[PDB]
Each structure stands twice: as structure tokens, then as C-alpha cells.
Subunit: 53 residues, 6 copies
Amino acid sequence: SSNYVMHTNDGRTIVTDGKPQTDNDTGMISYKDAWGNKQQINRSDVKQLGELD
Amino acid sequence: SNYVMHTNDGRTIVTDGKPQTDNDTGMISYKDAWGNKQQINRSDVKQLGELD
Amino acid sequence: SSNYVMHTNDGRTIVTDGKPQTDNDTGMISYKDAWGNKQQINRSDVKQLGELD
Amino acid sequence: SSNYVMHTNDGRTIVTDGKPQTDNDTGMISYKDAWGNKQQINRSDVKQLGELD
Amino acid sequence: SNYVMHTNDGRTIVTDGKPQTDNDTGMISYKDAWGNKQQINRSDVKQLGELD
Amino acid sequence: SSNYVMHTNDGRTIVTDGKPQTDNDTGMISYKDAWGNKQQINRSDVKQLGELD
Ligand SMILES: [Cl-]
Ligand SMILES: [Cl-]
Ligand SMILES: [Cl-]
Ligand SMILES: [Cl-]
Ligand SMILES: [Cl-]
Ligand SMILES: [Cl-]
Ligand SMILES: [Cl-]
Ligand SMILES: [Cl-]
Ligand SMILES: [Cl-]
Ligand SMILES: [Cl-]
């Protein structure tokens, strides 16, 4: 498991704990934030996704 | 567990249980606080999270 | 079978006879109106859909 | 087999010979026009689809 | 058979054979007049028809 | 394996090492850049994609 960075279309930068995934129930992009909380965002709002080094 | 949905038009919706893609319509189906089944378009949902 | 109320993005309110469903051939949302007429609309034009009590 | 009418978002009205279908190769909406010619349009450009009576 | 593709930005593209959804990218894949494989987004295609 | 040129809607030109592909977990377009870095972008941001000769 490796951390990722998501750049959103509204100019935010989100660091994820592990690789984000399409949620099986909602079709949204599911991720765990740096505080361990599970969040979901719309794929259409994600501009770029890359593994953090 | 209850969830909070934030829409692109600025609404905050609390769901009873986790929302899911409706098998018939492809919309996001959820149960409101009163037990009624509602559907909204995924493209109108900005954020979705478990409520504390 | 139960009736539904559909709100479109152009501000219309449509009552359906039975639950709307994705048409297998076109991928559009198929429904029967209050007058028994079968229509299809695009999912992207549907804002809300809810069961009538 | 029955004829259909498509209303596009640019204000056109297209009568089809038979029911339009998602093309298996392209994912576009495939239809046969009133002159017997096979055409394809994008589903996103279709506002409403209904069988002609 | 050759096809004609009209895009939303006003381009007219002639393809060698019928275009198809690319299995890897989900884009519309086609072969140009010179035999080169190209891909465009379906959302940019307005019309697609067999060329006479 | 062959290199590709990707044109984005924001006017960028990206050369990829190998063919880009839809990521199985996120549904985004995964690619390796000229510097060997793995990135993911949204399909809706890709205007054109073509094989380099
Ligand atoms: Cl999941
Ligand atoms: Cl998407
Ligand atoms: Cl369902
Ligand atoms: Cl059907
Ligand atoms: Cl849709
Ligand atoms: Cl077909
Ligand atoms: Cl569509
Ligand atoms: Cl392919
Ligand atoms: Cl993958
Ligand atoms: Cl897409």
C-alpha cells in the first residue's frame, strides 16, 4: 500500500492513505484522508491522481 | 450507519444507511430520515461521507 | 407497482405510472406518463426521482 | 417494428424507421432515417425519444 | 466501408473502416486515410455516418 | 510496446511511454510519462490520443 495525491478541478490538493477506488455502491471515488476518515468525491471533480513519492 | 451528501447546488442531505446506485435508473438512491426512498443524479453529488 | 414523481433540470414535474427504468436499447430513462404514453428522457436531465405515497 | 421520434437539444426533430439503438462498436445512438440511411448521434444530444403513433 | 465523423468543434474526419470504442481507454478509436490509428473522445463526436 | 501522444483540453501535449489505459480501481486514464512517472487523468480531459511513428 502507497499514498496518493489528488488534484481537484476547484484547485484543492488531497493526500490519500492508500489508492483511491470507485465505491461499489455509489460509483463515487472513495478514499481515506490523512486523518483516517473515509470520504467520497465525484470522479468528474478529479483533475489528476498520482502516487506520492 | 447514516451518511451526509453535499450537492453541487449547495444542499446537505442526511441518509439513513449508505446510498447506492439504483439498479433500474442508474441514479443515486437513498433513504431519507422519514424512511422514504429518493433518487438524485450522481453528477449533482459533490461529496459523500459517513456522518459522526 | 407504485407511481413516482420526477423533477427535471428544465423545471418540469412529471408523474410516472410505475418506476422509470434505463431502456436496454437506448440507455435513456424510459417511463410511462399519467396518460399512459411511453417516453424516454436522458438521465442527465433528471434532477430528482421519488416514490409517491 | 414501430417508428420513433427524437427531439435533440439543438431543436431538431428526427423521425426514425424502427427503434434507435446504442451502436455496439461506438456507443453512439444508431438509427435509420426516413430515407433508409443509417446514422449515429450522441445520446447526450438527445433530449427526448418516443414511439410515433 | 469508410465513415464520416462530425465533431462538436466543427471538424469532419473520414475513417478507414468503422470507428470503435478502444478497449483500453474507452475513447473512440479509428484508422485515418494513411492507416494511422487515432483516438478521440465520444463526447466530442456530434455525428457519425457511412460515407457514400 | 509503442509510445503515444496525448492532447488535453487545457492545451497540453503529453508523450506517453506505452499505451494509456483505464485504471481498474479509479476509472481514470492511467499513463507513464517520458520521465517514467505514473499519472492518472480524467478521460473527459483527453481531446486526442495517437500512436507515435
Ligand atoms: Cl467499495
Ligand atoms: Cl465519471
Ligand atoms: Cl436498486
Ligand atoms: Cl427496456
Ligand atoms: Cl448519464
Ligand atoms: Cl450495433
Ligand atoms: Cl451518455
Ligand atoms: Cl480496441
Ligand atoms: Cl489498472
Ligand atoms: Cl468519461
